[PDB]
Amino acid sequence: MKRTWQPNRRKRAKTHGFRARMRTPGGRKVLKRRRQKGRWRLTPAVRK
């Protein structure tokens, strides 16, 4: 049966991408959060 994960590069980077995070106050705080923690990736990798 159709499972929930149907990957899509365009959907991934438009939804969770860096520029998506940057245009929203919540989103910026996410990036601030992940920098503070030392996350290697601030953003889900997607091959464009």
Binding residues for RNA, rule: CB under 7 A, are 1-12, 15-16, 20, 23, 25, 44, 46-47
Rounded to 5 degrees, φ, ψ at 39 are: -55, 135
- Overall residue count recorded for the chain in this entry: 48
Q: State the Cα angle at 13 between 4 and 18, rounded to 5°.
A: 130
**Residue 37 binding result from Mg ion, RNA, none, given CB thresholds of 5 to 8 Å by partner type:** none
Question: Any contact of residue 35 with Mg ion (CB under 5 A)?
Answer: no
Which tokens belong to 12?
């991934």
Shortest-Cβ-distance residue relative to Mg ion: 17
| Residue 41 touches which member of RNA, Mg ion, none, C-beta under 5-8 Å by kind | none
